[model samples]
Target chain A: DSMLARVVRVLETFNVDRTAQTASDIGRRAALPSSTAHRVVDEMVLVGILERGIDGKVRLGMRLWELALRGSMALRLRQVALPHMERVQQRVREHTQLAVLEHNEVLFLERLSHHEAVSNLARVAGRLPVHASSSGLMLLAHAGPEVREEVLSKPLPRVGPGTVTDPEALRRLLANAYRAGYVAAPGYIEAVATGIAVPIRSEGVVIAALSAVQPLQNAVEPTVEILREAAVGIETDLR
Target chain B: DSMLARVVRVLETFNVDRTAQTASDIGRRAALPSSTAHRVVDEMVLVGILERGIDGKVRLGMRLWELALRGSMALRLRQVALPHMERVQQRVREHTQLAVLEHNEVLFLERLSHHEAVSNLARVAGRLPVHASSSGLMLLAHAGPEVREEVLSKPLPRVGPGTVTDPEALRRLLANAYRAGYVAAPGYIEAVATGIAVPIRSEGVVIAALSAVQPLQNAVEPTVEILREAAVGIETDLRAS
Candidate 1:
């Protein structure tokens, strides 16, 4: 079990900006015993979970991607959601994204944006604070009672221009989102943009959030209508 | 380590058609002892690489996907190739795909098809025989000589009606594809489809293939031309990305 923990620590060291690192670097970042880090990395390299480049820096291997994707829900959901997301983008002409709740954050599964669109923080495999992002609010609104309380108990960190940091204010926001069946937060995650999201459900359970990011001045109703329609389409397809 | 190999065997048992299974099912499929299988499964579940359902079946976990994709080349490549692939499909009005060589097979990274388009066997995470797939052939053509020889030494399994099983014929096909910079194989994968592929390179080395599938009677010239342009566009973006 500790070996698996070490592996997780090694994998967590790589990210979008930091894709490659030497074994010693991993050891330092993961705070592992040097010998244990070297042994763990060697085992991973031998198994193709991690691959060493010509320069001897290691990266997450394609073999890991294939195994993780072959039967995973993330891939299955993305495959079903992409076309629907594409249709939304075709009409809305804005940044459209799909996200699921992961470890108390909104982990974006896919995103489509115009090259010239306003700056947005979400990226594929990127994460945003659940108390700030629109997708996070919508998902949090529908989460179990204890999960909601657990989040509200923490001091919410401010991320964007209009983040709701007060626990009571955040509770009111979540309640309103659940009642309205969608959430629209202008300048919540960014100053120049607004994020609007609707919950996507399968078999009577909310499983993900479908969202669009638009300019601050744009009307949110039209995008909300589009997302609602698209969410229903995705749910139907999921069934 | 044998532990790592056992983990891979456990993972290999969960595929597109079989996403969930009991520990015993995993043991049988992975050919591991029952106690060992249970222990491995428990460890995987504890580490979030696998998850147990309410019904006691386990499936690949979302944490695994997140870890695999966060900094992986496959995600990086797919991100750059997608817009270009979509453009090709918009113009060609056919199935478009991106694939890379994996264990001597063509592992598809992404595929986009019209709802009304002809049937295709390539799914996002699926694999096809390298000798019978156009993308496979294109990748194999540019592969190292020793890799090509190893494949040629094996019994060339017949996968399609037009598959080149003879070692000499396959060699000629690879040579022509390498020289011509593209490949067109009619009925080499599916009888009703023709696959046309062009190699995508990064830093003068062949890394992947961009391909389009059309009906057998469609003119291969136009599609080939589109694929060539798209491949170059992708290569350019990879430079800038």
Candidate 2:
């Protein structure tokens, strides 16, 4: 009921698909009265959390970047992983990405896109279901037993023609992923592309996933091997 | 104070250098009583703003990444700029950067590094003086009269051997920047590197600076020309959509 907590909840409503909104819209979406929303949004705008666009819609402020990136562990990890990701990008000439599991989904932290590559659905800060994506599978496979079970129990959402929606099948696939040291899915999320991913460990525990998106017809095994090698290289760097 | 506000303040203390700390350490840093610090921190750990590290120390939580990146405007802009910045990196093979002016400094939003490029001082989310670096100069030049005068009227901190510390001289330099439409500095921020920057504007106001870092030996004219072309391209994209 306090204004501070309400502020965070209000800020949480703007996402990639919902970048800009009117104050009344935020009120409705955040379940606050119009007057309370107006007051909180105004305070946040003054403090640079929400910015008013020329069209009178509000968006998240650039100050969020300063606050988030300056003192953030995620930004630090992304910096540490940049050179390795660049190497993978240069060698593979495809879409190379890094993701961390958050709120039962894979939240992409960084991505390198080649101009000639196929269009990618993954954007920076974008999220995807943990059962359909190669990165998601890698993360889910290495996730702790509790988290893994919690995610596996959920209804698997179908993303593409090749998506595996059956819970028991997903459980088996995750087991195989543990044995194979990586995951590969062709046409799982998109018909025009394939995904290959491997888990990156920190201190012997899987902490993130390093992945690549390639054309469906391209060689998937070589990419998986490269990601595995790169994951080892990145782990060494993290240590 | 509300528990949430105190939690935010506690998080503000763990910066890029001080990423991990003991509970007592955090108490001192955040200026809270040790017991109070422990309670607040433990509650935060329960909520996932702080996490226990492998060394048994407390560090910023991974969940913070969700709150920071999801639904963030900065993340949206960085998404839009990544592919284009990659193009610049592929062509120049240097440090191609995107930065915005924040709190009177140039905050680098993203940076692309080449394997063999000269070592740069900037990291992602790192800050440089708005009057010292090439990108800073570009932003200051187009930052409008109020911000320009306020920054120049203060005591400028000299960052490097060639930094301009005199206010009058900085004013003149900024005026030249406005007229030339870009800023090119050789040996201003580093001895062995040169910086070239151009302002990227949206709705006729400079919102960010697009820049490149090159070796001191390389001619800056070429780099400046390339960056100007890229800035115009970015501006075009912002205007169209």
Candidate 3:
């Protein structure tokens, strides 16, 4: 691989769960030689893309985050979705989220949750399989034909007890989302929760999924109505 | 300079306002040769750090943002602060923000503003002068004496009508912020709005400033109380993590 590609591979080793590591550890994870890893890390340190903490382990730098978000489509979408998501969270008083398809995975961009909100597994920058989430199904339902075919042709992974693993059933559910303009899957992702979602479009193509997770008893009616409303608001403000 | 620094400087050129550019434009802005800029752009696009549109204008890519945020202190702190910041915005119904001192500048990490809220110029990942911003003053107050002295020794710039430009007056503001645990500046950064801020500490060190920009009529008293409450919540979460 080229030097630039190697740097990216090194970065790919870190995640929300593993935020720091030693130079050697990074090399092992990135499958690089220790010497190569140390050299590239030296470059990153000088450029302020990586910092060695007081403990002498390396972590991502503030500059990297600044550069990443400044001109990002993710940030722009989140910027437009935030106020609307906040309004949805305020009205629904539950977990409201915005997600988009990335590498056939549902990557959550933003989420708003109250202190009293129900159990939700999604966090900002987190991802889930496209066939196993409300936002995922919403996105999958509206995805282009190539993406939908790729997902449906494979044996669906059994993500949880609540998940519908049968491809035919999932296709039906996704088709229903298009027909009804939203998806309400109660206990279909988490046993005690119902995930409701609505599609958001830009340029007349579905670009994102706005969703809310609530307890089973809270009624998907309000969540669906609030998410659909917020989706419209987000779709309008996206430009 | 090394190729990595060239890449860094290239990415550094983009901000909230201008996100896309041609390779020639990027070269001129980043002080790279046209040939070098095009080569680097090719490398970055191959790695999915930058993307080129049908118009051939290049922009930062989602992969870059993902790499930047997935493991960042920015995301960790923003996660901790988001819920509390939401509560603060819900109560204050204005523009609430979180910032940290970075290279002597106040870098905003997140902001929440209502549709009818007073206009706010600060955007996510944007920076402002340390001596002129409410969050900057809050951070400067809690910063070690070296940072404080460096700022005080320089001639302060007049950022807005509410700014205290005189070094003596600015020092007094910083001292009071240190003593009082909060700051309320009216029209310092904006003509009609007041900026209220409180320092957030982690591991017994001041790490960030939680702030609000509001109309003067909204009453600074409530904003102060709400920010302090949010700061405490953020501190707790930082510790637990």
Candidate 4:
């Protein structure tokens, strides 16, 4: 457990924007001592989890990618959803994303964005709180009651002005999300955009959120309608 | 070493097609005893490497994806290559792939496919031999002599009718690949497709291969030319900020 946790902590230091780091940088970011960081990183590098860059920067190794994708459930979902997401991107001309809950946060698995689409805050393999984004909202709404309660009890960080800070308000919104089987929030996470999301289930259990980020001016109804249809298509395809 | 090796063996049982399986199935495939497989799998599920499905089936957890992407150098290359590959996909309207040599094989890091692109055999995170595919050829050509000689000396399985099986012929082809700064193979993997690839370098070393899979009937020259320019763009980007 000690070594495993150390490895994960070291890995946690890297993100979408900070994909490469030095041992000292990883130590500072992960709160590990410089010596400890170097040791674990060296071990990981030796095992192909971390790769040493030409400039001596440490980055994630292809071994990790190979291990991740070679036999990953996410690969199957991404492959199945790719054509549909492409279709959605073609129609919506905006950012379309698929996310699954991991480590109590919304982890985006895939995203399709056109060059001219509205700017989005989410990145592939990025995370958002379970209370801030529409995808998170839908995921939380359908999540087991324990998860819902835990998220509600936690302090909701304000991602934007419209992010629900009050626990009760979020509870009601989640109720609505459950009833409608989707969540649509305009200017919630971003001032210039709207997010509409639907839940994607595997074997009748909500496992992921299939959502789209559209410009503020676009009608949410059409995109939501399209998403609902697509969700059904995906669900049927899964079946 | 035993425990870690078992973990890796468990993880390796999942692939594009076999994403989910029962413990017994994994055991059978991994050649481990059923009880051992179950125990290791249960431990893995507890540690979040595996997740149990509604029907009690086991699948690779998203935690694995997070760990792989979070700190991965491959993901960095992908971030740099995706936009550029998108541009290539737009221009060529075909499957554009970026691959890096990992463990002596060309491991695909990312792929951008257009709707009407030619059929591609590679997938994201897939691997191809260092002697067969165009991307492999480009990487192999740029690789050190040790790898080239080792790969050429091995029995080259006939991937398709056009795959060069003779070591001398492959040596000549690799020489041309290096001289031309690219590799082009028609019907080497599939009869209806052609692959054109160029190596992308960082700090003067060939770090990756940028390749396009196009229709055999299509103009390979244009795609090859575009990929060459894109490889330069990638090199400049990696060199600069």
Candidate 5:
């Protein structure tokens, strides 16, 4: 409808799997008129929002990153959380992660892991189901009843073998997380790994989930303790 | 200018120091009419590009970060280099950093440092002078003649006592970086630190700089060697991936 809206539609066309695309592909994907898409793409390139490669494909520009990240909440949160996550990494020696609820999904902001760490399905700047991983469960548990209903009222697709797809079972898990301030989802997102998470609070609110993914056979309580301590440290620093 | 151009202006008004602002402040800084600024800000909020807080100030939204990073070269480069950087970090036990040249400044993408490591001024997603740090020098040396001339002809400010302010001296330093394939600038940024850097190349062109900042008294050669090795590993991964 509007030029800014059109530009956003064009930008939404690029993703991790589709980093570079021709103008025609973008037009088709964005469902914009070809002429309008061309004009918008060219203008975005001119303003440094999109970068056109020498081969004539466009990708998200470094300038967009500079603008998006320079003063972003994601950067601020990651900055505050990384050192503590590093501490968790030192102890757990596995996948240390930080995530927040965005659009009812768990958006992973930062992940630190050793080279030999357990295989983790999460990645930095990646997303997962709100009803799936420990991080997502912790976030969803505190996201209020309305969001809980919105998610549980639907037929939950199984992300992993251990995922609790039944609404009542999932509600009990959410209740447990709320009461315990942590979630330990064994084989929830992956059969071989267990996701342990604790809430990272700010201003007495559960703003994020600090998590660790470890081998399914590893101890959970110690990892949970490590995450809880790290979360407190992060909250202290946030204050 | 189109509405998209106006929106860009609004987004550009935000930076590390000015993360949150009122619509009026955005209007003033971006030089947009108040009505246009308010409308644009409101629309951005609606579309999830900019987020408005309960206090009525707007900040760069998480949605924007997702879109910008989801398919970005910055994310790709950082992901590829982080493991190698961790190697450098473990050995150096100081500030191991990755940066790229952006608009004539060194835009740091990532920095890994110990809790008790030496004090360094660089921050992730922050910018530093192109001629004032080892990473910047490494990037500038390979940035070709035009970019070199544009930077050299200007008066370089003294960021530290050891910063190369004189144009000719700086030229010699850049020349050395080109010939040596690495740079070790002692006190170029801070008096107590030595910045050692090597170029991270992609497709045979330097796309980024990987560097380590150590105490000024540390041996430069060993850190230089570590950085050079890490840069090569990063370059290799960039190709294989």
Candidate 6:
């Protein structure tokens, strides 16, 4: 059981920026005994979860991505969201994204971007702080009580210009988002980017956040409308 | 180690078409004994690889997708391919795909489609027979000898009107593809769709395929050019990234 948990931590150490590491590097960061890390990484590579490049560094394998996604129900929602998100990107001319709440954070499932748009922080399978992005706010506003309280209880890191660090201030924003049906947080993740998002529900529960990252000073009202329309489309598809 | 492999098989029981199942259901299909299946599945849930739904059925966990992708070098390629594929899909108004050869099949890494596009058989992470589509032909053409020999040994299924099931014909197609740097198969995989694909190489070895599926009447020459351009862009970005 401990071994399995170690395996989980080892996998977690790989991220969007740091995609490769030696077994020793992984073992150290994952806080495993040097031998345990090597053993786990080797076994993972044996099964094609981790792979070794010619340079002798290990990275998450293509087999792992396939096995994770091809078998997941989430891919169904992702499929339904893609075309709609693309529509949002086309009209808004920005970075449009779909995210779901996982482990109490916003896990982006799909993203549609215009290469010429403002810089976006969201990547597919990447995470965002629950209070630091519009999608995160949209999701956090509707999350179950325990999740909300857990996030509020922590020191909310200030990422962008509009990030609300005070617990009470963040609570007000979440409540306003839930009441108004969307979140428009200007400069929420970066100074030059504005985040706008709407909730997507399946079976009457908010299951995802449809969002776009646009340049600061761009009118966000239109982006909000596009997300809502697409959310409705995905909802209809889900039902 | 056998237990780990068994665990892998159990997870493999879930797929695009069958995402949720009871332990018994997974056990039956994965060929595990009831107790062993339950034990393995429970452990997976504990590790957040699988999650139990409200109905007591289990599906793939979000954690699994995050872990599988967050550290994957493939994500860089996929990321590079996305914007480029979007342009192809826009101009062609059809299904544009990115894939790599894995386990003797074309494992699609990413796909872009407009809602207005024609019906498509490819999904992100879906698999297709290597000899039955343009991408497959492109990959199989540049594949190492062992892979080529093994696939040729099997009965290549005829999936579409244009599928070259005969070994000699398929070999010729692969050779032509290597020489021409692309594949244009009319009505491959689907009778109504024409598949066009180009090889995407890393360093010197072909590592992936960039492809498009358009209507039968639409000339594939333009699609071929689009794919090759995107392939070159990806190759350059891979160098920088």
> Per-residue lDDT of A175-229 in model 5, one digit per residue for the tens?
9999998899999898899999899888878889999999999999999899989
- List the global CA lDDT of all models: 0.89, 0.81, 0.85, 0.82, 0.88, 0.84
How do the residues B161-191 of candidate 6 rate in per-residue lDDT, one tens digit apiece? 8788888988888999999999888877888
Worst 10 residues of 4 chain B by lDDT: B1-10
DockQ of 3: 0.72
Error of 3 at B241 (Å): 3.9
- Every candidate's DockQ is 0.71, 0.50, 0.72, 0.52, 0.73, 0.68
lDDT at position A74, candidate 2: 80
Q: Is the docking of candidate 2 incorrect, acceptable, medium or high quality?
A: medium
lDDT of 3 by residue, A37-82 (tens): 9999888877888888999999998889999898577888888889
Candidate 6 lDDT by residue in tens digits, A1-239: 36667778888888878988999999889988898898999999988888899999999987778888985766778877887777777788778888888876789987777767799989888988888989888998998668888988877888988788887888889899999889998887899988888999988999888888888889878777778888888898788
Can you tell me which runs of candidate 3 are displaced by over 4 Å?
Answer: A153-155, A165-170, A216-218, B53-56
Tell me the tens digit of each residue's lDDT in model 4 across A1-239: 36656676777788777777899999998889888888888888877778898899998877778878764777777766766786787788888899987767899888888878897988887888878899999998988789888887777788866778888898899999999988988777888888899999888788889999988788888999889888887788788
True contacts kept of each: 0.67, 0.52, 0.72, 0.64, 0.73, 0.73
Q: What are the RMSDs of all candidates, in order?
A: 1.8, 2.8, 2.2, 3.3, 2.0, 2.2
Candidate 5: residue pairs that collide: none
What lDDT does candidate 1 reach at residue A47? 90
Worst 10 residues of 1 chain B by lDDT: B114-123
Candidate 2 scores a C-alpha RMSD against the true structure in Å of: 2.8
> Can you write out model 4's per-residue Cα lDDT over B1-241, one digit (the tens) per residue?
3555567688788875577899999998888888899988887787677889777999888877877776356766776676677668768877889888877777888877775567888888888777779989888888888988888877788886578788888889989999999899998888888889999988789888899998888888889889988888888888875
> Could you list the chain B TM-scores for each candidate?
0.92, 0.92, 0.95, 0.95, 0.91, 0.92
